[PDB]
């Protein structure tokens, strides 16, 4: 599939290390921040795409969003930052 | 507003990805076959509705249906795949 080449070539250029990264622990692909991966990333590489577009792709290859973790007294969860794991790697 | 819910908790659920879903290029949301959206999932999520009704939501809320290509040398068009995409 050319989204594959695609997914690869992105995460892989350390150049759009501030965007998308493979994680420091565990085996998985973190966007820290949503809207500033889709301005500054997802169009460079997926022209005339969204966030949705990119996520269902990620889902057709195995790549599904990990379980929010709440955090503190609030239970909060930084609806911004998105990590995807695969599901052969768990 | 009760539409946007009703809309988003339609087309961003997984499940009903083989009668409506984001499109693989481009951002818009596709139902490849309107008669099966409206039997399948239409009518589960919205009881008692029908498709233009549901479209005439989508327009008021910015949705519009996309420009139709002809294709072949038919200038063919697919009557019940629809695609729509926000004014912005």
Known sequence: P??????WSMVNDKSNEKFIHWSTSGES???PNRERFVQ??????FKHSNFASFVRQLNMYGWHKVQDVKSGSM?????????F???RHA
Request: aromatic share 12%; no cysteine; glycine share 0%.
């Open 75 to 83: 239970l909060s969860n930084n609806d911004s930052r998105w990590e």
């Open 29 to 31: 692909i973190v966007v």
């Open 85 to 87: 794991e695969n599901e």
């Open 2 to 7: 050319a989204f594959v080449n695609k997914l």
């Open 40 to 45: 500054e990333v997802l169009k460079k590489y």
